[PDB]
Amino acid sequence: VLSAADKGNVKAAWGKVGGHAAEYGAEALERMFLSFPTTKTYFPHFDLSHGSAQVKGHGAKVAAALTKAVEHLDDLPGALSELSDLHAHKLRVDPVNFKLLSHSLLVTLASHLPSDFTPAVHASLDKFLANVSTVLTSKY
């Protein structure tokens, strides 16, 4: 349900992210775990300390899913179907946590793309991440 303008802004911003997506995913996870420690309890088998290969690896996976979403904005439900089942049915992730990760991702993107992260682009990226979150919680 992203507008044409929002889709344009998301594609352009994610293009600017380019090859740094995995790095930014890892940083977003780190920021989420430090700012919102309750989120750590979804990852009891992880070392969540700074520089952990598990945080690095998971951040890469999250970023890859976001890249897939950016390439399929017209059909996020289909593209993210497997991930929706995992997060909602298997893991039972509380919807509030999607807002925490989304905020963490916006902080990360603003930090690294200060010239690109205009108010309009911020608004578009916020809607994008909310849309992705809605799909991943769609079983609810």
Binding site: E27, E30, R31, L34, S35, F36, H50, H103, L106, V107, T108, A110, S111, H112, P114, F117, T118, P119, A120, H122, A123, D126
Partner: protein, 143 residues
């Protein structure tokens, strides 16, 4: 916050431009969460993103908001007392839903990130998340 954490946030806050960051935060609130514009009818043209961000009343009001945050930063052990007057204004007079206090705090954090980049570390950001949650809770108290 611990004493050592308070010292860390105080040193970082020293660097923040009081003339600019507040205006940017309020402007982004109005653009990203457009229902918040309901409370600022008297501020004139908020009809586009560029109008919001270039509106002198938004910039002026944002400076006052950041001044309030700066005051909060000097009274971290008694945010409730510090924000009592503003709580009355926002809750009893303006009827702002308290969820919006959290939104503005988070927008401020995004603005600090945009303006300070790598210096706004995950550790420092986590400290500021505690501060803005504290401010939001203090503003909401009169509910």
């Amino acid at each position: 916050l611990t004493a050592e954490e308070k010292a860390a946030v105080t040193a970082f806050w020293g660097k923040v431009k009081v003339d600019e960051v507040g205006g940017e935060a309020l402007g982004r609130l109005l653009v990203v969460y457009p229902w918040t514009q309901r409370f600022f009818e008297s501020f004139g043209d908020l009809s586009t993103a560029d109008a919001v961000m270039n509106n002198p009343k938004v910039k002026a009001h944002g400076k006052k908001v950041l001044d309030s945050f700066s005051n909060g930063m000097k009274h971290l052990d008694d945010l409730k007392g510090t924000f009592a007057a503003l709580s009355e204004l926002h809750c009893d007079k303006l009827h702002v839903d308290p969820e919006n206090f959290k939104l503005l705090g988070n927008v401020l954090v995004v603005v600090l990130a945009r303006n300070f980049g790598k210096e706004f570390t995950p550790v420092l950001q986590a400290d500021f998340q505690k501060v803005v949650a504290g401010v939001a809770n203090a503003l909401a108290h009169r509910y």
